Design a protein around this nucleic acid. Structure first.
Lengths: 102, 89, 63, 46, 77
RNA sequence: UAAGGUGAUAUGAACCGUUAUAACCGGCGAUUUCCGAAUGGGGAAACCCAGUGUGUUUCGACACACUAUCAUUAACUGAAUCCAUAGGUUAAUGAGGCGAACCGGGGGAACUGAAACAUCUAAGUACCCCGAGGAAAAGAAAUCAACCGAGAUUCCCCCAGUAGCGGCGAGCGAACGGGGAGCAGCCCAGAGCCUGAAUCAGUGUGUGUGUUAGUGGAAGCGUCUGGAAAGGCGCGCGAUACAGGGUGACAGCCCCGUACACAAAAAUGCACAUGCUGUGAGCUCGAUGAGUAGGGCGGGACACGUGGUAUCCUGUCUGAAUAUGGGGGGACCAUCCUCCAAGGCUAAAUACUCCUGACUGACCGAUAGUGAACCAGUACCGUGAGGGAAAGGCGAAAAGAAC
RNA sequence: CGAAGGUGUGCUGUGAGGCAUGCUGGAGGUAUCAGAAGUGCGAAUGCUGACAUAAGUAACGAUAAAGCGGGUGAAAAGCCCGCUCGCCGGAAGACCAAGGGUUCCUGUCCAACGUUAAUCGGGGCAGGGUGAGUCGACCCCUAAGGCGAGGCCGAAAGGCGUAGUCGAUGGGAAACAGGUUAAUAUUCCUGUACUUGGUGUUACUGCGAAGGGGGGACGGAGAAGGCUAUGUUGGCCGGGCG
């Protein structure tokens, strides 16, 4: 009951990174996934001296909405919607436009 | 019976302070935070059976909580019980 | 733990397990108040273990 | 000047405490109205 | 309270009407007296607070059945 | 159902997982400190003090369980006082407290209007108290009617601001009859034939349809502006789905949904058929509710204020006949007509919304809408009852400003 | 390739108004003709918020009174230390009850609070602090009074009251001196004590209540005596000889 899962590869449909692809690192309950190396923000990391302090301006990955990413088809190379079928008694995902299981 | 379970549940923590250290030096007295129920007889029974040390006498006091302010919320801290357990020379 | 494993045990073994779990609980919380237990999470799991034993100590003891 | 409020927790609890409302019918109506409004301090007891 | 045990009579309410038709709330009380009746079934005296019409009822229907319906309604005698 | 989680402010730490007993959601269970009807006694609520019995005593003590009051029933005793009651002990069952409105009953104002005011009005209102239910009350003619007839109660629209009542002022205001909603009748006062008889109240067995978690669910690409396309342009497809909400600007085809087709281990709700427990059914014969109807006095209710005032309820004093009889038909009398009081039960149509879900709005949009969109019955004020605020908005994303 | 709103300008209508467009703004608006109003504000000693004025004006809360040196600090009239001066002293000192509730103590901070400044604080923040057989409560008993099984009375609610049961401001067993913490002490420590119960052997032995008796157990005023608390003086002891 969840289309874009953790270690899936996705393309991006919307944004400054539109069309660019990558694999998903983590999925957050706010309806947002993180895809590494695709949405880079330049945070000013403040040093708080009660630890070891790297400091500086560190670029990291931001959360992108899960509506903006779509599962890569990896055969034709364009984005694809995925649905759920019952290929056998455990419910499984499958690409539309060609009945292929992920 | 359910005696030793109560003995395990009455003790909470050892206290660390300046007065606790001065107590253990000048009087051989340990200071420890107990449960709120904590009669002196069951405190003595618990520290004897669990800590392997004979006990002379036990004094107990009640430490009231301080009404702190966090942000704008007034919140009282929890009310706990302190015990000075005196060990045998 | 495995709750079915405690279902296969008897009254005396579950009572000795309860007293051992409470003893381990006391040791862990005194160690946590003392400064050690970098691994704090065991505290929670030990608490849950005692609760599970008491559940069967009502349930296997009779309805 | 001596003021009207000269406090005492004994007269306070005997006059407006929880058991002094629970003794009479009109005190139980007072408590029903405090619960219907939804007040935090039902009586002055502490 | 002023309740006849046999007839169940209560004080009722109403008005003092004047000669100028002023209405004031008054009460009508029953003609209540405590009288002890000789019951030869249990063969003693039983005191009852009865009205005078209740005494006329006990004179018409005997005391033994009136005590039976008094026991039926669950009163005290 | 599940590949992500350990509630929020609210990061962090240590962990738990991924094919199944991580987490989450649902049914049933377990534990449920103390106060509170508070129930062992007391008390300044959240505290103090016990008694009795059983088992665990390392002998310093533990751990459970019971002990309120009242009503009813039953058993032992039991005075004055032979008898016996009163009284006392014990057990079993039941009740008590709270809750928004609706309902029934016991009490019951005044302001106000009358251009003053006393009868009257407001008004059987506000309020107080008692009691019950998901509805409650009524309810099966001693009713109306008119010489024709209708057939229990309740609710709505007419009749009709009509007859009437009224310092005949202010005001109050029917009924008969008509159209509808919904319709259901019984039983004891007592016996004989008879006992699973037409049915109702409760247990299990089964089915249906619900409720309590859920599952699937269609079809869009290029190009221009732009921070970002869902927008403009072009070219397609789905539709029993173009309700809605999000998505970096306005998306039927990105997502969650929607139409639709489906789903329950276990718990219940309603219908049934089924099986026990109580209960009578149906024919014959009788009986048919007495300090009652009525009356006198004093009040109240009927639209009806004592008036010529019928009818009903009663505080008080009386007091019948008892179906060859009695009530009513608006003073009352006679003739007709119609019914059978002094004993009860009863569904539906009707009223209400603390609370639950869904949907809607020529409703509001932060001085509005609930007092309260924000940790609001809060802060604060008052001895108390009680009164009672102000306060929303960075951005798409903290990328919340290193140096 | 820019909506509402805001802010200017120019046109235009007899008027309420309208149209256009510049800048701001960054997502909405709405023709025409119909329809419905929480439909138009300058006044109500209107209500709510904001902001003026008086005006940098009065005042800065006992006329017990300060001055100097050193320190700290970015900064000292006010803080700390020290030396003088002043004030109270049947209090402006020291212990509590009630009432507050952490205001106590230490470190740190000076936005707001403090009628000024503040390095200070009863302010913010983090930590620490309250030790009892003998003190007090709880406890046993009662007063005034409250509640009150049954009971009596009352439309209902409820009122009064018996046996009981609470109710102190009263009656009831027991601990003193010295030392110690930054903050507690009749609580901790040292020394020396005392009280009440249970339990267990021992010595004798009639004990036993919810009842009887005593005791507890009691006014005002006055006066005298004996003491002590306490103070003064002298002696003694240690220092001084200015």
């Amino acid at each position: 009951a969840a289309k874009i899962r953790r270690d899936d590869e996705v393309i991006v449909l919307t944004g400054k990174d539109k069309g660019k692809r990558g694999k998903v690192k983590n999925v957050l309950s706010s309806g947002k996934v993180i895809v590494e190396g695709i949405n880079l923000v330049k945070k000013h990391q403040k040093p708080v001296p009660a630890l070891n302090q790297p400091g500086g301006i560190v670029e990291k990955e931001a959360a992108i909405q899960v509506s903006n990413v779509a599962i890569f088809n990896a055969a034709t190379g364009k984005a694809d919607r995925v649905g759920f079928r019952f290929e056998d008694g455990k419910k499984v995902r499958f690409f539309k436009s060609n009945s292929e299981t992920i | 019976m359910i005696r030793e379970e109560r003995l395990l549940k009455v003790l909470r923590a050892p206290h660390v302070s300046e007065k606790a250290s001065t107590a253990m030096e000048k009087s051989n007295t340990i200071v420890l935070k107990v449960a709120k129920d904590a009669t002196k007889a069951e405190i003595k029974a618990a520290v004897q059976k669990l800590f392997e040390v004979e006990v002379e006498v036990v004094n107990t006091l009640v430490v009231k909580g301080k009404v702190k302010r966090h942000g704008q919320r007034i919140g009282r801290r929890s009310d706990w019980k302190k015990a000075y357990v005196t060990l045998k020379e | 733990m495995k709750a079915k494993e405690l279902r296969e045990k008897s009254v005396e073994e579950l009572n000795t397990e309860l007293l051992n779990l409470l003893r381990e609980q006391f040791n862990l919380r005194m160690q946590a108040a003392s400064g050690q237990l970098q691994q704090s999470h065991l505290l929670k799991q030990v608490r849950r273990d005692v609760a599970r034993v008491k559940t069967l100590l009502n349930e296997k003891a009779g309805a | 000047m001596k003021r009207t409020f000269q406090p005492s927790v004994l007269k306070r609890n005997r006059s407006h405490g929880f058991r002094a409302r629970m003794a009479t019918k009109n005190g139980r109506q007072v408590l029903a109205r405090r619960r219907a409004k939804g007040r935090a301090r039902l009586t002055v007891s502490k | 309270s002023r309740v006849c045990q046999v007839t169940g009579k209560r004080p009722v309410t109403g008005n003092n009407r004047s000669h100028a038709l002023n209405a004031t709330k008054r009460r009508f009380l029953p003609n209540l007296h405590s009288h002890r009746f000789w019951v030869e079934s249990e063969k003693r005296f039983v005191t009852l607070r009865v009205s005078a019409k209740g005494m006329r009822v006990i004179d018409k229907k005997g005391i033994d059945t009136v005590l039976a319906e008094l026991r039926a309604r669950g009163e005290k005698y």
